[PDB]
Amino acid sequence: SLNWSVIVPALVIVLATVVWGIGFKDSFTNFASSALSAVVDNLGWAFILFGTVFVFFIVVIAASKFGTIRLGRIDEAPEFRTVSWISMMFAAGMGIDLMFYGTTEPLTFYRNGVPGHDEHNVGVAMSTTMFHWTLHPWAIYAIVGLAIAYSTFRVGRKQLLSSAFVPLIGEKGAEGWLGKLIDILAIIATVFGTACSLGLGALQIGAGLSAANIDPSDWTIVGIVSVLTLAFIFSAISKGIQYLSNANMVLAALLAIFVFVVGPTVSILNLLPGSIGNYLSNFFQMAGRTAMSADGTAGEWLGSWTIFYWAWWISWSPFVGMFLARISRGRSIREFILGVLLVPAGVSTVWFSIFGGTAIVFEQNGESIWGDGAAEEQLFGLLHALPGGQIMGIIAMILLGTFFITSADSASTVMGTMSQHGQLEANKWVTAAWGVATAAIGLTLLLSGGDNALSNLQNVTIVAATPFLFVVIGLMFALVKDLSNDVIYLEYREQQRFNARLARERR
Amino acid sequence: SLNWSVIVPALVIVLATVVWGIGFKDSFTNFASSALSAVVDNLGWAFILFGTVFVFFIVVIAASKFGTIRLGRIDEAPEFRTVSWISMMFAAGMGIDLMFYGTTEPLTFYRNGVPGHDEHNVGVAMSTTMFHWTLHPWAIYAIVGLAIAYSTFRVGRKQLLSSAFVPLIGEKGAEGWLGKLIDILAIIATVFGTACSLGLGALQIGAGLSAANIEDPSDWTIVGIVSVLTLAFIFSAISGVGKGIQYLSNANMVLAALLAIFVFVVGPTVSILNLLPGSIGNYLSNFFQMAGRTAMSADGTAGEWLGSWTIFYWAWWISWSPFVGMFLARISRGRSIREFILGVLLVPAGVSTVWFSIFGGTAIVFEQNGESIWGDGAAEEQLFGLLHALPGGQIMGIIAMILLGTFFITSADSASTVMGTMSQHGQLEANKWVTAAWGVATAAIGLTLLLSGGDNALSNLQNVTIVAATPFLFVVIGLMFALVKDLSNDVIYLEYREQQR
Amino acid sequence: SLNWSVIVPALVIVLATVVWGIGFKDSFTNFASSALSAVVDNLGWAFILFGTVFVFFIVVIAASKFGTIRLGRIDEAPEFRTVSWISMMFAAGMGIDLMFYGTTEPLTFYRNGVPGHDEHNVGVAMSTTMFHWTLHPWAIYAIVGLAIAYSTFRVGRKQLLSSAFVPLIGEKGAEGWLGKLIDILAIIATVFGTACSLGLGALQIGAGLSAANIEDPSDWTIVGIVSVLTLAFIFSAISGVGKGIQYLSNANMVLAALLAIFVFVVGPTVSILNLLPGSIGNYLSNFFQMAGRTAMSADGTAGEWLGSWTIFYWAWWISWSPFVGMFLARISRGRSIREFILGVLLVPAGVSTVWFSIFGGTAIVFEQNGESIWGDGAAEEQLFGLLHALPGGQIMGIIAMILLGTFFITSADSASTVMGTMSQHGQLEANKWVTAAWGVATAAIGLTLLLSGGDNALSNLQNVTIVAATPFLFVVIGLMFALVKDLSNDVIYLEYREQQRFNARLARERRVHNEHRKRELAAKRR
Numbered sequence A: 001s002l003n004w005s006v007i008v009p010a011l012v013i014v015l016a017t018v019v020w021g022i023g024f025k026d027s028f029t030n031f032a033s034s035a036l037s038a039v040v041d042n043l044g045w046a047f048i049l050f051g052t053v054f055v056f057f058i059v060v061i062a063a064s065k066f067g068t069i070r071l072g073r074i075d076e077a078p079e080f081r082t083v084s085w086i087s088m089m090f091a092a093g094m095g096i097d098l099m100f101y102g103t104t105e106p107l108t109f110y111r112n113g114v115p116g117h118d119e120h121n122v123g124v125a126m127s128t129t130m131f132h133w134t135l136h137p138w139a140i141y142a143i144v145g146l147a148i149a150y151s152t153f154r155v156g157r158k159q160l161l162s163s164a165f166v167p168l169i170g171e172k173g174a175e176g177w178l179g180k181l182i183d184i185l186a187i188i189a190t191v192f193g194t195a196c197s198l199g200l201g202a203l204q205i206g207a208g209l210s211a212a213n214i215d216p217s218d219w220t221i222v223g224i225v226s227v228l229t230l231a232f233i234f235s236a237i238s239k240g241i242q243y244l245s246n247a248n249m250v251l252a253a254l255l256a257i258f259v260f261v262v263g264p265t266v267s268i269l270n271l272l273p274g275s276i277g278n279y280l281s282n283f284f285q286m287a288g289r290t291a292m293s294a295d296g297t298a299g300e301w302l303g304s305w306t307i308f309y310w311a312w313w314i315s316w317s318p319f320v321g322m323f324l325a326r327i328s329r330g331r332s333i334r335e336f337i338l339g340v341l342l343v344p345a346g347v348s349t350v351w352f353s354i355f356g357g358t359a360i361v362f363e364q365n366g367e368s369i370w371g372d373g374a375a376e377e378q379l380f381g382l383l384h385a386l387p388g389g390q391i392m393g394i395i396a397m398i399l400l401g402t403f404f405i406t407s408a409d410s411a412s413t414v415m416g417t418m419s420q421h422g423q424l425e426a427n428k429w430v431t432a433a434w435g436v437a438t439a440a441i442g443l444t445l446l447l448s449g450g451d452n453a454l455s456n457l458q459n460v461t462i463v464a465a466t467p468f469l470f471v472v473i474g475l476m477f478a479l480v481k482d483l484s485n486d487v488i489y490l491e492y493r494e495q496q497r498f499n500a501r502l503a504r505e506r507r
Numbered sequence B: 001s002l003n004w005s006v007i008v009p010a011l012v013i014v015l016a017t018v019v020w021g022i023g024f025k026d027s028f029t030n031f032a033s034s035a036l037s038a039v040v041d042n043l044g045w046a047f048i049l050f051g052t053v054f055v056f057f058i059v060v061i062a063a064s065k066f067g068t069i070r071l072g073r074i075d076e077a078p079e080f081r082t083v084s085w086i087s088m089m090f091a092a093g094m095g096i097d098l099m100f101y102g103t104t105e106p107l108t109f110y111r112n113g114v115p116g117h118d119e120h121n122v123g124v125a126m127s128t129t130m131f132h133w134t135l136h137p138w139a140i141y142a143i144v145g146l147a148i149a150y151s152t153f154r155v156g157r158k159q160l161l162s163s164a165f166v167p168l169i170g171e172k173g174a175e176g177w178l179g180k181l182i183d184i185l186a187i188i189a190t191v192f193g194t195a196c197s198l199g200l201g202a203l204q205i206g207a208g209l210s211a212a213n214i215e216d217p218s219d220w221t222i223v224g225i226v227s228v229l230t231l232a233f234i235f236s237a238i239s240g241v242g243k244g245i246q247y248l249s250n251a252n253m254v255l256a257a258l259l260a261i262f263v264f265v266v267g268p269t270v271s272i273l274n275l276l277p278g279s280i281g282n283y284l285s286n287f288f289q290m291a292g293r294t295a296m297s298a299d300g301t302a303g304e305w306l307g308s309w310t311i312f313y314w315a316w317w318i319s320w321s322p323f324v325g326m327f328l329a330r331i332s333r334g335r336s337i338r339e340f341i342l343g344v345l346l347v348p349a350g351v352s353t354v355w356f357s358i359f360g361g362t363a364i365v366f367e368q369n370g371e372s373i374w375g376d377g378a379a380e381e382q383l384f385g386l387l388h389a390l391p392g393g394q395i396m397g398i399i400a401m402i403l404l405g406t407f408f409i410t411s412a413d414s415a416s417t418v419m420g421t422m423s424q425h426g427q428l429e430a431n432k433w434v435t436a437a438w439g440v441a442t443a444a445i446g447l448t449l450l451l452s453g454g455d456n457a458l459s460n461l462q463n464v465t466i467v468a469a470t471p472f473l474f475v476v477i478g479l480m481f482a483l484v485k486d487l488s489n490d491v492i493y494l495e496y497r498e499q500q501r
Numbered sequence C: 001s002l003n004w005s006v007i008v009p010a011l012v013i014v015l016a017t018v019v020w021g022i023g024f025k026d027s028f029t030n031f032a033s034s035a036l037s038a039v040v041d042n043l044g045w046a047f048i049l050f051g052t053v054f055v056f057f058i059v060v061i062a063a064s065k066f067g068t069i070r071l072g073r074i075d076e077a078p079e080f081r082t083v084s085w086i087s088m089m090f091a092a093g094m095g096i097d098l099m100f101y102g103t104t105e106p107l108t109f110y111r112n113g114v115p116g117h118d119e120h121n122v123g124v125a126m127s128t129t130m131f132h133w134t135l136h137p138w139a140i141y142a143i144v145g146l147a148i149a150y151s152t153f154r155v156g157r158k159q160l161l162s163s164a165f166v167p168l169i170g171e172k173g174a175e176g177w178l179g180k181l182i183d184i185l186a187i188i189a190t191v192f193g194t195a196c197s198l199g200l201g202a203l204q205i206g207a208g209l210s211a212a213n214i215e216d217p218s219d220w221t222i223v224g225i226v227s228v229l230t231l232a233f234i235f236s237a238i239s240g241v242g243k244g245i246q247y248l249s250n251a252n253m254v255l256a257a258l259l260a261i262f263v264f265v266v267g268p269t270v271s272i273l274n275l276l277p278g279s280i281g282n283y284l285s286n287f288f289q290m291a292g293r294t295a296m297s298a299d300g301t302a303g304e305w306l307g308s309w310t311i312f313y314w315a316w317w318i319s320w321s322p323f324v325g326m327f328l329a330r331i332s333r334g335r336s337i338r339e340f341i342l343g344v345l346l347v348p349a350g351v352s353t354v355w356f357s358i359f360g361g362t363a364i365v366f367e368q369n370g371e372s373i374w375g376d377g378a379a380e381e382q383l384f385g386l387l388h389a390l391p392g393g394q395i396m397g398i399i400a401m402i403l404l405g406t407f408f409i410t411s412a413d414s415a416s417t418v419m420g421t422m423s424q425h426g427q428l429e430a431n432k433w434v435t436a437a438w439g440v441a442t443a444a445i446g447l448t449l450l451l452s453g454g455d456n457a458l459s460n461l462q463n464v465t466i467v468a469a470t471p472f473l474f475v476v477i478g479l480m481f482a483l484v485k486d487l488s489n490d491v492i493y494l495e496y497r498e499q500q501r502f503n504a505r506l507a508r509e510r511r512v513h514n515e516h517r518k519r520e521l522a523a524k525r526r
C-alpha cells in the first residue's frame, strides 16, 4: 500500500528540477542558486549553532539515565555481536564522499589556510577536516538514528520520520498537515543528499579516465552515470548491496594500506596523534566560526566549506539514520550513541590522515599534486606520484563505480521504505524508481553549470537541505518527550523518590 | 530589633570616608585612590585565581549529591515563578551600567584589543566581554546566595553573612572577632554599592540629557536627577502595599526587552544572529586562557589592562556579593540548590550574552562598515551614539534614558532592603525606616562631594569600590568551605557519618 | 631464593654495554646515539598518541566503580597513610630531576621559544614545561603502579612486574617467551635509569662546585665525587632494614621546602604568586594543542625540537616506570584505586607546578630585567646562578649541592629496593645482599664515563637508556588491558555488575505484569 499522498508530491519537486533545470532555460536554475546565498546569509547561523547543538544534545542524552534504556522491548539483546555491529558502522563511514574530498580537503586548507590562521598550517588544516567529518555530522546521524530506532523498536511505531514526532504532533492519525509534510521533506532531502555523492562521484570517474584513456568531455558524464545507473537497476533484483558492501571495503583497503607504506609512513603515522589533538584543541574555536570572524570575512569560506557539509549531512540523515537504526536494534541508547560517534570517526580520522595527509607532505617537498586546482583530479594525481600508482587509479575508478551503485541501493531502499508507510519489506520496483529519479537529479546538477558543475551541485543540495534542518532540530524535542515518558526512566524516577522516602520516615 | 553594635562602626566609618573627600580635602582622597594599585598588584593573583575557582565550585557542587537537596522542610512548596529571577537577577545585580557597557566594552576590545592578541578580533572582543559578565560574576553570587539561603531556609539560622560561617567558627561563638567585622564590611560594601549605583546613574544622565535637552552638566543636573530618583525611590519603599521590587523589575525587563528587540531588528539582525554561536563557541574556546590571564602575561605587559579591567571587574563584583547574593535568597524558598545553581548560571548567562551580542555586536558591525559610533571615546556617550544611528533613535533614546531610571530605584531600594534585613539581627522583614534611611545615607555625601566647587570628586568612590571589599574576597573563600564542611553535617551525610564510621 | 635465569641474561648485557662504552670501540657507542633517530622519528608518533591516552585512561578508571576497590584483602587499614606518599613520590620517581631541569626549562623556553610560538612567552614557557613534569608523566606511573599494586596486594601474588600480565598471558603459565623476557627488560631499565641519575650527581657537582672551589677540568677530580658519595651512601649497607628510606622523606621537605619558601619570600613573591593560576590556566588551554605536537607540526619542522624535549621525555619515563611503579606500589596497601590515582596525579603534579612557578618564574623575571642567569648554556650553572643572586646565595647554594646528595641516595636506595626485589622471586623483605649489589651498577660505567681521557663520553648516558626500554612502551600499552581485564574480575565489581542484572530483570517482571493487568482491567470497562 504505497503512500501516494507522499510519493507524487515528492516527484513533483524532483521533476521540477530536471525539467526546469536542464530541458528548458537552464540558465534559470542558476537563479535559484542565488537563493543559496540567500539562505546562508540569514539561515546560515542556524546551521552553525544547531550544528554544535546536535553534538552536545546527543552526548548529554547518552550521558543521562536515558542511555540505559534498551532500544526494543525491555532488556532486549542486540541481534549481532559488538564486533559485527561495529564491522557494519565502518561500511557506513566510507564511500564516494571520502574518495572525492579525501585528498583535496586537507590540502586546500594547507594550500590556502583557514580564515583565522595563516596558510601552510598542518594542525589547523587537519583539525578543520575532522570538524566536518567526525563528531559533528555523526551527532546528527545519531539524532535521526536514535529517533527512528526508538519509535520502531521501543514505542512500536511505523518506520517513518513522522512516527518520531508523535509525542509532539497528531496523533489521532499522525500525518495531518505535518506528517505527510515531514516525510515529504525527508524524501526530497535524501534525493539531493545522495545526488551529491552520485554527482561529485560521477565526475571523479570522468576525471579519473584521464589516467587510462586520453579531455574533460561533457557527454562523458551522461555516460558514466547512465552506465552505472543501469548496473543499479540490474543489481536491483537480489541485495546485492551486501555483496559489493565488502567489495567496496576491500578496494578501499587496498588504496589506504598501499599509500600508508609507499607514502611518507611516519608522517601519516604522526598525523594520527596529531590530528586528534588539534581537533580537540581547535574544536570550540572552530565551533564558533561564523560570518563575523574573521573580521566579517569568513562568510565566504563557510559557504564553500563548513556550511556546505552541514547541509549535506542533514540531507543524508534520513538515510544514514535508518541504516544505523535498523542495525542497532537491541543496543542501549548509550552504547548506540558512543558507538555511533567514535566508530566511524576513527576511520574518517585515519582516511584523511593517509590520503590528504600525504598531499600535505608532498606540498612541502615541492611535488604538489595540485593539478591545476581541481579536486576532481587531485586524487589520481596523488597516486600517479607513487610507484605502480596507475593501476591504483584504475582501482579507484572501479571503486567509485561499485560505490555509485551500493550507495544508490541503500538510498533508494530507505527512500522506498518511507515512500510506502515505513514497510521494512522494500518493494523491489519502487526502489529502482527512486534510484533513477535520484541519479537523474545527480546528473541534472552535474550538467547545468558547465565548468563549475561542482558548484550548483553543492548549492541546491544546500537549499533542499535547509527545510529539513528545522525538522531534525525539532526531532530533538520529540525525542526528549519520547524519552521522559518511557517506562524505564519513569520507573527509575519512582525508585529514587522512593529510595528517598524510605529513609524519610525511618529516622 | 535594630542591632546598634554594627550600625555604629559602619555609620561612623562611612561618615569618615565622605569627610575625607570633601571640604578642600578633595585631593588627599585622590592620592588614597592610587592606593588601590596596591591590592591589584599583590592581590591580583588572588582574584583571578579564585574568581575562576568559584565558577568550578558551584558546578562541582551542583554536580554532586548536595544538588538534589532542596532548601527547606523538603518538598517545601517553592513560591516565586520563573519571572522572579531574570528580573531581580539583572535588576539588582546590574542594569545601570550594563547599558553603557553593553556597547563600550565589546566596542573597546575590538578597537584596541586585549593583551596577547591583535585588534579588531570579533571573537576575542566578544569572549572577553562575555568572560567579565557570566559564569564568573554569578558564581561569586551563587556561593553567597546559596550559603545564606541554606543557613536560613534550611537550618533556620538568621539571615546574616556571619551566620553562614557557623560551620567554620562555632555555635554562636561567631560573636567574637570574626563575625562582627563581617557585618561591618558587608554594610560598608552595600552602602558604597548603592553609592556607586547612584553615581553611575548620574554620569549617565549627563549624556542622556545630551540626547534630549545638552548642556555639559552645569550643576542642577546631578541634584535635579539624583535627588529626583532618590525622592522617587523613597516613595516606592514607604508604601507597604506597594512592593516596587516585584513590579519595577518586571517593567524593567519589559523596557530592556523592548529596547533590545528594537536594535535587534532594525540593526544588523543577522550579524547579531551570527554572533550567538560565535560568542558561545569563542567563549568556550578562550576560557582557560583568559581564565589564566595573569599579570605575568604577556612578557609582563597586561599588568595595567588587567587591573583596569578583569581585576577591577572582580574586586568590584566581590563587593556586590552580599546584596545580590542575599537577594538570590530573599526571593527563593523550596527549590533545590541544583535547580538554583544553574538558575543563576545558565540563565543570567543567556541574557547577558544576548544583550552584548545585540548591542556590542551591532557596534562592531558599525565599526566594520566604517560608520563608527566611538566618537571622542566616552563610555557614557556611546550607547546613545549607536542608538541615534537607527530609525526611531531619539525616541528609543528616551526610553533608554528611562531604563537608567528604572531598576535604579529598585537596585537602590532592593539594595537598601537587604541592608535593613542585615541590620536587624538578620530579619527577613525590616522596618520601613531603616531601609529608606540608608538609601539616602549616601545622598548626604553626594551633595557634599560636589560643594567643593565646580566638579572633581566622585572619581574617588569609583576606585574606592575596589578596596571597599578587598578583604571581602576571603569572606567568599571561607564561605566556600563553610558551605562544604556544613552540608557534610546535613541530614543525609550525618546519618552515614554517625553509623559504622 | 634467587633467579639465576633472569639475572644471568641480565648482567651479561648490562656490562656488554658498560664495558662496551668505556672499552672496546669507545666511539662506537656514538652510533647508538644516532640510532635513536630511528625510534624517535619512527615511533615518536606512538610515543605521543598513547602517552596522552594514558592520561584519559587512568582518569576514567579513577572515576570508575573500580575506583572503590581497595588495594588488598578488603579492609587493610592504610599502611603509611599520607605525606610519606608525596615525599616518596618524587624522592623515588623524580627527586633530583626536579632541579637539574626544573629551574632552567621554564627559562630555556622563555628564551628560545617552543615551536609554534615566538620567544618571551611566559605562557607557553609555563605550559610546555608542565606538559612534561605533571599530568602526563605521573600517568605512566599510576598505570604500572595499579597494575602492580593490584596484582600483589589484592589478588595476593608475587611483586614481580611481569605478574600483572597474567590476565592476558594466563596465570602461572606466563613464564617463557613472554614473562621472563619482561623481567629481563625490567632489571636493565632500572639499572640504566639509576646509573644515569647517579652519574648526574657527579656532573652537576663537578660543574656545580664552581660556586665554591675546583676550577680545574672535570675528570680525575670527580674521583672524589662518585667514589666518596657512594662510599658514604652505603649506610645503608651495615643496616637497613625493611622499610625506610623515610629519613629522606621528611628531609626532602624541610630541605626543598626551605630553599623554595626561601626564593618565594625573597624573590618576586608577587610575580611568582601571579604565575600561579597562570600556570594551570595556560596548561589546560594548551593541553590538547600540546598533545597534538608531532614531527609533522608545525609544517614538518618541530621534529628536532620534540626529539630534544617531548619525545625525549616520554621515551625515558617508560624506561623509568618499572621502578617508580614497583616502589609506588608499596606504602599504598590499604589505599583505594581512586585515592591512589588522585594521589599520584593531583598532588605530585600540583607541586611540580608551584616549583616551576617559583624557580622558573624568578628565573624568567630576572630576564625581563636583564639579570639573566643563563650560564653559557649549562643546566648546572643556571640552578645556582639565580640563588646566589639573592641574600644568602652561598648559604642556600650549600643546600643546592649538599641536599642533592640526599637525592642521590633516595633514588639509589629506593631504586635498588625495586631491582633487588624483582630478582628474588618477587618477595618484599629487605634483602641487604642484593640491595648493595645493584648499588654498584655504575662503578664500571659511571666513573668510567669520565675516565675516558678526561671527559666527553656523552651522550652514551641518555642514549643507551631510552633505547633500552623501547619495547617497554608497548608493555605499558598492553598493560591497560591487563589492568582493566583484571580489575573487572574483582569480586566487589563482579558482584556490582551481577546485581545490576538482577535488579534489571526483576524490574521487568514487576512491569510486564501491570501492562497485563491494566489491560484485562481496561477491557473490563467495556
Ligand SMILES: CCCCCCCCCCCCCCCCCC(=O)O[C@@H](COC(=O)CCCCCCCCCCCCCCC)COP(=O)(O)OC[C@H](O)CO
Residues within 6 Å of the ligand: A059, A062, A063, A064, A334, A338, C055, C056, C059, C060, C063, C064, C065, C066, C284, C287
Ligand atoms: C583539558 C584536559 C585536562 C585533563 C583531562 C582529564 C580526563 C578527562 C576526564 C573524563 C571523565 C570521564 C568519567 C568516566 C566515568 C565512567 C562511568 C562509571 O564509572 O560508571 C560506573 C557504573 O555506572 C553504570 O554502569 C551506569 C551509568 C554509567 C554512566 C555513563 C555516562 C556516559 C559517559 C559519556 C560521556 C562522554 C562521551 C564521549 C564523548 C565526549 C562504573 O562502571 P563501569 O565503568 O565498569 O561501566 C563500564 C561501562 O558499562 C562500559 O562497558
Ligand SMILES: C[N+](C)(C)CCO
Residues within 6 Å of the ligand: A091, A092, A093, A094, A095, A097, A320, A407
Ligand atoms: C553511508 N554512506 C557511506 C553512504 C554515506 C556516509 O559516508
Ligand SMILES: [Cl-]
Residues within 6 Å of the ligand: A068, A069, A070, A073, A074, A075, A076, A488
Ligand atoms: Cl529497558
Ligand SMILES: [Cl-]
Residues within 6 Å of the ligand: B116, B296, B297, B298, B299, C121, C122, C123, C124
Ligand atoms: Cl602568556
